[PDB]
Amino acid sequence: MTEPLPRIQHYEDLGLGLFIHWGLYSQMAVGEWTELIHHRNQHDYEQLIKTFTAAQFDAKKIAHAAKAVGAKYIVLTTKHHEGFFLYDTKGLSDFDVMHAPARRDLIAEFVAACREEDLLPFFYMATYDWHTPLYDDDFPAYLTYLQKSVEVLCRNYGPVGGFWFDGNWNKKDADWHLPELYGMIRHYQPNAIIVNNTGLKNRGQVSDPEIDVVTYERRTPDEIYHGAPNEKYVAGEISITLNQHWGIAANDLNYKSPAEVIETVAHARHIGANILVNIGLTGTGAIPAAAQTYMHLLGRWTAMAAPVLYKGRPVPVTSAHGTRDFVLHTSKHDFLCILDLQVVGNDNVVLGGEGVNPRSFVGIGQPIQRIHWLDNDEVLSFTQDLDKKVLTVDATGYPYGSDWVVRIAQIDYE
Amino acid sequence: MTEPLPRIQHYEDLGLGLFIHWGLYSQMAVGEWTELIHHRNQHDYEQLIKTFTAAQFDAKKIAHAAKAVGAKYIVLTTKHHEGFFLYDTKGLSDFDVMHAPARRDLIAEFVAACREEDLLPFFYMATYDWHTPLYDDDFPAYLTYLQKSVEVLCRNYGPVGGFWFDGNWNKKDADWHLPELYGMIRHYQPNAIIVNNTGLKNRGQVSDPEIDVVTYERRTPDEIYHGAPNEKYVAGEISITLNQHWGIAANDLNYKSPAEVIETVAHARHIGANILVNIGLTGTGAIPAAAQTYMHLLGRWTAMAAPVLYKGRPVPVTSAHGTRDFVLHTSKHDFLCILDLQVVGNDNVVLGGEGVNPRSFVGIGQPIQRIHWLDNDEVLSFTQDLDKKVLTVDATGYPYGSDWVVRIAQIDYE
Amino acid sequence: TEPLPRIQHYEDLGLGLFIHWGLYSQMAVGEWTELIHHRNQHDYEQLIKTFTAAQFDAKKIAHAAKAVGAKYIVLTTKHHEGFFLYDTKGLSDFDVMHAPARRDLIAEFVAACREEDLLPFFYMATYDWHTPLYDDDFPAYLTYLQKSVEVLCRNYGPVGGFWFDGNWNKKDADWHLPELYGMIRHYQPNAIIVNNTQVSDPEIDVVTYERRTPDEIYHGAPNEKYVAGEISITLNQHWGIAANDLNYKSPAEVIETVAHARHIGANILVNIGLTGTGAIPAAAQTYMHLLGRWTAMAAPVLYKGRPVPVTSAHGTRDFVLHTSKHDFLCILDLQVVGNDNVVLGGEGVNPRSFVGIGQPIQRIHWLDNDEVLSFTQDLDKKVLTVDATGYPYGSDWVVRIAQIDYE
Amino acid sequence: MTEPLPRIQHYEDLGLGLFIHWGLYSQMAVGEWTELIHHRNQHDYEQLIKTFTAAQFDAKKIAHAAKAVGAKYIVLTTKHHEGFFLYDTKGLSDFDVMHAPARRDLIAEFVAACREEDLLPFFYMATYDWHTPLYDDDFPAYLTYLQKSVEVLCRNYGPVGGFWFDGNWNKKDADWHLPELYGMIRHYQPNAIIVNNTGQVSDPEIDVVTYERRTPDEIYHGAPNEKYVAGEISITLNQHWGIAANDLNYKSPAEVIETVAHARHIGANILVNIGLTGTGAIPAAAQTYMHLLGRWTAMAAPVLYKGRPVPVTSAHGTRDFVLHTSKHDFLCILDLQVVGNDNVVLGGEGVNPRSFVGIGQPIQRIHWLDNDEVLSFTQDLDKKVLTVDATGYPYGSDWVVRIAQIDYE
């Protein structure tokens, strides 16, 4: 029964973010966990620092691509489990980009590029670290090292959109000293969104009062947890990757369809969450061609969906038996999100979408002036039963040559 | 009881072809049927000839891309329903590429490029034509025009891999004079494969003795028809497009997953058919970026599957209850094609593929020396019951960093 | 093309009861036992000596048909095993007159049907395992088959129909159907002829279909004779009784299949296998009582209702049936209504739509309890949307039927 | 992770029980919740006591039917939400069978019948009660009334197999004084099984938790260092527990068999429910299900009682599973077809390899329980793989869940 604090309300309006995984692992192109899962010799793996040139990393291109896909923030891996830092740690560690041939603070380039495009920069930081022996040998000292690495991020790069922490699940029973860590963040970055990824086995959990967002990794839940009754509201976020891996994986051919990606983005909004779509950069920091294809396709959809994608919120309006349709609410309009439509041919050439296609909703109590598809402005016919709050629209199929996967009709009230 | 003629045997070894739709419709990017389905003014639509530059058509790059994806032939639209010819009709018509600014016989460039890459060139020819008034006003004269247009293709381009006719379904009861049309083809191109697409309502029918291949458009059948029992054997072919349209359609976002494309290719081989994977070129003749992504991903799979994709054939060996696995036979080996595998993590991090995974097959009666995955040469453990012809393998999951969608194990016999 | 009167009458029957009873019934391991279990023929045929029919009461069978809402009964007069349940008058010694029963069972059956206003139909297997003629002299077999049918055509008065089964065993043979059906037409001009095998002869009235045929059935060519259709269901996996077949379908599935038949424009036969001595088993009685509650409720539409070009909205299994005065919405996948405290699933407003109704509606009500439903129409697009309320607590009809009353 | 108490171990060996719903509601045949859900006038509904004759209740027939179906206990509704008691409450209430024309202690008849058949009598008791005003108007006094009603059951009927409490879910936040209620039960009936249908372990004295029918995974047996608790699932034949004449939505007999097998697989007991008629008879429809289930449980007798879940999984895409006794393993195999022949193809004809992972011991022989046919098999002992040719049913039979006994070397 609490409502979101302004910065959280601002976060929910972001809607869609791009997740970016890039580290030393990227050179191998066999997934970001390669060092542990393939049981590599650490010394040999860590030699990858010597060929980390970042020769194709262009933060401007990345920010441009995020803008074009309709993303409003980017979460970049500043340090993954491998423990290599993509920024200047100022003497905290020698395992950082300043000790690689790249010799560029990549996080500085990233934040400048985000600002030029009006995107919020978010920093992913692994809390489970494979590089520093402090992790197992002196946990209290490890917490200090982690906190210092975050402190550098809080003080050297201007205002930060958010932090995305990951790895506390590796030591479920430890005292991670979150009030000190989060408190430090609140001191230097009062407006930052704090996310703690509590991992696959503990979905929806709030690990500290300072947490703003709970995560659902890889897969969508049925409902988003918004925090205990009477406590601070926390937002939710789902994250998906295009194939089975987060870092680039050259021989992972198991990509989701573009259509499924569109349905997952719409679905997140339906259940009241943001969604992160992940891409893994190449070894040298380029967006791979495959990811570019997905971004172009999703980008066509998000441009069409712009009136509702950001401000639209769940509302107690359900769809009729046997359909996957749903409704989103802004302060001026309702929007019918309609799935499973077909292309329209003509009476001679039948594509599937030709016949009258009544789609009903329960929970709309106000007389409607008009309804129209966002993609082409066609006006739909509809009937209402105001007492039972029933709306029925004839959801016409796609014009030949197009197929939006999730089609959106805007409702204009009297 | 008949066996395939040599040319048809050669056809079945092709396995995979690339279908290419390119015409005036391409400039509009709203599907190849746009002229009819969107009720365009014919005069105005046909003005698209004036901006047909083919400025980005490079037959060499196209043939190279076909070779890299593992295709062994290409079917190119020489004339679609719109009735515009991509070749020099030598006085038959003014509605051809020689009267467009391109001024290049595109079919000549195509055939030369195919030959350099050892690909068979196939010519798609629409028999239902929206351009010539002969079609409705004087059908007998239309048949003469169609036959002459095919005759030009038969005499001016060297040996032709095949012809892919489409549109007889528009007049199911007409006499199309197939003996004369196919007799002419047999005269000039005795070795050509003749395919007649009998359309969605008439799957797998033989419209003349000269037909070599029956088609199944868009969708896969349960069984491939090989002709009436004592008659000429005919091969089968399934055709699929990446989204919902054959020509390019910019706002059709409803793409199939790469994984489904891989499964459909494997499936086609399982049931004893070739498969055509379709791309629509841009207005100026380029392979679009999205199609390139699919070709790169499918290309990794077909390179791995090369030992079996071409020579492999269906064999009476079935898989155990509840699996989608199947077997292909070459003269030296059997190959287990195994679906629904997961990635292998480790003891600590579980991804799904870790446990022993017994997959059984019924119909293998010969003792086996060894079994190994094509992708990494790992040796699989197995047991046999020779009397009941049971084989059981432990189908290990993918090494982290990879996912082949359909994984293939080669059997080596004693 | 218009159905002949007898075929129009047939389609109004709607539901029939199929009865399988033969020597196989004594073994209670399915009607194909002789062939599938590779039994010694001589030994199997000895079952004639214990065929007493001690518990066969044709009146109880006719009563069970009436209670289930069936309008005809198809009885196995001779199955593949080749034993005749009637007096063949010298054609064969392998008939009920040579068994201890010593009763013409078909005569008792026809009298019982008549008393209950039901049509008697005779199943006759054309694939026969008894007579050596079948393999050793096919032309003479056809004569024997025809004679056995002739006895049925001439000794019992007017018959409802004949249900032939087995031509599929020899798909390429000449069965001499014009002679066989011509003989039937001579003695029994009004009888329905069904062939369980596509139309194999002009005299066929009804073809059989697979119970899961999705689409409305084939009625023959535009200028040809109209042929009706029929689907069949058995309660478990076997037609004759099978004591250790526990794989019974749900009553709900049986109800759905009966409704589905009407939706695609077919009759439906529900099968029971009698015990060795001719009794209806207790399990079959349970199904009859449950289906019988449904068919009594559905009576306004079950007989006269016909398919009509009105489709249901996306993701629904709902369908419409038409009589001359009314349309009926047949609505599936409803839930029971509890309250605010006790949620059973059927509580919320439940809009179910249909496309193809162009006339203004006065009133719509459920057949089971007369509750009036609210609805809206778009007459131009022919859309109807009803609030299909869920079942009153304590009931669940599986297929619920709403009658439409027009203005 | 501790070992079950003797009484609980004995409970798990019961395997299958019959649930029986019978009360005043039965006379209306529109479900057991009719009084509340149909918003009936309380005074008028409660008049049903005057026609409660029990004229067709025969506890002996009920116990016989339970025995024949292979059930080892019966849970009878002694008082449902309607609040009418099927036993002599000895002055606690006038709304009991002694004030109805029946004038017979039905629970006494029930316990005697169970004993003659070697079945454990269990008493269902609704804790959510619609009759007494105490329930809403004076909850502390209600708890006393409930406890007294249970006390009568604990002192007047000899040793009681168990109690099956239902209704605490109506007031999830209330203090139900379970230490006192269960403490009283422990005093008079130390060996009784206590089940609380929570709609979680609500008190240390609970022996059995109830679970959903469709629970996929092996059940929760209590926190790691604490008392082991058993599990139980329930199924009814249609949508209602009391009789409901116009509820035609019956499950298939096949689904009932699969649910019984499934309960064993997850390590639970299962209750199959029947609702008696107004006058206390088993309806004909219920009899059909019991005859069918009975055929299956008689065949499954070697494993149904003593069989327990074990870490042996089935191959990809099958629903097969394994149960373990001290002498044998049993393969429970689903989705088989009938065997015809080459000419008449019924589906079960081909070799049908079904695999399991987790068996590490060499096997001597495997055979179907229904007909003793010996199955062929191969093993890979290092990877613990077993593959059997699971032959289809002989024509004329179909067991739904077929069971193969494994005999070890």
Ligand SMILES: C[C@@H]1O[C@@H](O)[C@@H](O)[C@H](O)[C@@H]1O
């Ligand atoms: C988003 C994912 O979440 C974590 O749990 C990591 O282990 C993965 O590598 C990835 O970063």
Ligand SMILES: C[C@@H]1O[C@@H](O)[C@@H](O)[C@H](O)[C@@H]1O
């Ligand atoms: C392969 C497809 O087949 C035909 O039927 C054409 O009408 C389509 O446009 C396309 O070329």
Ligand SMILES: C[C@@H]1O[C@@H](O)[C@@H](O)[C@H](O)[C@@H]1O
């Ligand atoms: C109705 C069924 O149909 C036939 O084909 C027979 O072979 C069956 O035994 C049964 O009579």
Ligand SMILES: C[C@@H]1O[C@@H](O)[C@@H](O)[C@H](O)[C@@H]1O
């Ligand atoms: C077994 C069922 O369990 C309870 O929750 C009751 O409310 C039902 O009526 C029935 O007794």
